[model samples]
Target: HMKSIDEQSLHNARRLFESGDIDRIEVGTTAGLQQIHRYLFGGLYDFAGQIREDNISKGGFRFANAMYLKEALVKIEQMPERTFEEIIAKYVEMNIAHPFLEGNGRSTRIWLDLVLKKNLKKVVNWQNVSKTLYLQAMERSPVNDLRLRFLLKDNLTDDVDNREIIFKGIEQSFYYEGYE
Candidate 1:
């Protein structure tokens, strides 16, 4: 009878860019990431924009504990985003932080793109990034980000303001989360 959470959130994601709200979101900060999360999942999730107070994990990997999560995010937010490597490293740290209870991947991908766009004048061409490779790279990222960097570095584009690119990338990001 009603739209699924992903369906509604997907629509919200499109509007984020369409309404030009995307331009106002802070770049390369935990607060900015929270803003994106809230925009995408505010109504669908009671915890939207709110950091998790419980520990979470996936596929045997444990994210930062709730007790230390805020502290970890503080440090991660200060991580430099000057270069592609630095940006990806910061992204990996945030992924480990996994601030929210849900929608981390979806929201964080947008966050990552914002950082990349601001610093490098580029964004990931997600339409070209393989989901399987992306998942594998991210899984191994905490240990070493070489694979993740390699995978993404080759797929970036300087078309930072392309509407089609942003929309398709958002769709691909949701796809990575099993939304489509």
Candidate 2:
């Protein structure tokens, strides 16, 4: 039900990117994730800005227990201010948290870029990398982050504005299959 991307989804996403809503909230926090969800898919999804009450399994991967989601998100929100690699590591931590039921990867990927924009002054050019490689790295991230780091290392660039960066990677996500 989620693979196809209509004109309206694209329109809403772009408008949200340009709306400066990302600047209004702490992108690293759970509430920030909810707001992003509401901004991106609010009209269609009734659960926007709320935590999922049940557990989910995707491609044989089980997410964190629903009971622990808030605590996991709190951990991510309070990550120590540190280097880019450190932030990436913390990003993986939250990725595993899988806070939202459907938009976890999309929202968190955007949130990850926001964190990078805040700490590194650069954005990951996800369009420049292969979706297979990125997904492989993310699949392996729970075991070791080196793969994610290795894959994303060269993809980071300083040339694009944040809005363009958002436009670049928002289409394809682990959930959306817009990548391939």
Candidate 3:
């Protein structure tokens, strides 16, 4: 579901990047967070904004958690000087931004993975997504914790290898088994 950008928009976004029309994606503010999340998950507005500024257990995770969804892609195509660490910083910043009231951890993690697949062509290994560790990574800062990248680094694809972590994580839920 990560590659569903309208053909025209995808073209424009890519063209803008190549033409040097835009170099940075502002994912720090509330509105900016909403826009990025919509773009990343195909207009999934369920958790696009914080339901309550004071509560973390109130709503969905459409934004803040998913804000990193584009930080890396922006870097891969725009700010070419950014290191993976910076990208990871953006990833962590999104969690801190917690633009939304809840679902930040889950949605943001999946959002990060898709961005990686689309831009870096790299997906974090899911086997490394320890539930406790993931929460810790999200609570901490990504700049100093490269290892947190493992917390749900699944590929946005059907390829067995690409979906190893996803499959491993949800193997008991759906009707399926993984093959490589």
Candidate 4:
């Protein structure tokens, strides 16, 4: 679970991270590299839930309710300890839970990375992450037995070096899938 940090504390930490003062971490996604941090630094913004789309975790969320965000935060706080994989697994689960209407994946992933950097002093490079692979892992994750984690492991090797390599791969995903 997450530690006993309040919203103000979370917001402040985000501020420090964004000012280029916290070089070790930054948020990244479609809107902007800083959007998630800014959003959470202020408080979660939501409008709707379960939006239907053609690809991926495509669904509009119930943005007004804070259940996903609050529940995930509560669960994280209650957790006594966490490993890198443990954190990622929790993150994957939280993302699937989709606490926010729009920025759930972006914010949750950024927050989890912060958790890794702060607690584990590590970074997970997502270069190697692929939509198909990611969906597969989510499918097979212990929660669902989907098997994406096993495959992500087979290629990533799950180390810092591998992290960079893997994330670099993910960075290219937008390109490979034609996002560019």
Highest TM-score model number: 1
32-115 per-residue lDDT for model 2 (tens digits): 777777776676566766788888878989988888877777777888646878878888988888876766777777777777
Scored by lDDT, the top model is 1
- Residue 99, candidate 1: C-alpha displacement in angstroms: 0.4
- Name the candidate, 3 or 4, with the larger lDDT value: 4
Q: Please list the residue runs of candidate 3 whose C-alpha ends up more than 4 Å from where it truly belongs after superposition.
A: 1-82, 146-164, 169-180
Give the poorly placed runs of model 4, Cα more than 4 Å off.
1-69, 151-178
lDDT of 1 by residue, 71-167 (tens): 9999999999999999999999999999999999999999999999888899999989989999999998999899999999999999988988888
User: Global lDDT of each model?
Assistant: 0.93, 0.73, 0.42, 0.45
Score residue 44 of candidate 1 by CA lDDT.
95
Rank the models by lDDT, top first.
1, 2, 4, 3
lDDT of 3 by residue, 56-152 (tens): 3323333333335445334433322134454565666556555454334444544454455445555455454445565556544434565554443
Report RMSD (Å) for each prediction in the order shown: 0.8, 2.8, 10.7, 10.6
Q: Give candidate 4's total backbone clashes.
A: 32
Q: After superposition, how far is residue 129 of candidate 3 from its true place, in Å?
A: 2.7
TM-score for all models, in order of appearance: 0.98, 0.87, 0.44, 0.50
Query: Candidate 3, after superposition: displacement of residue 101 in Å?
Result: 1.4
Model with the higher lDDT, candidate 1 or 2: 1
- Separate clash counts for every candidate: 0, 0, 5, 32
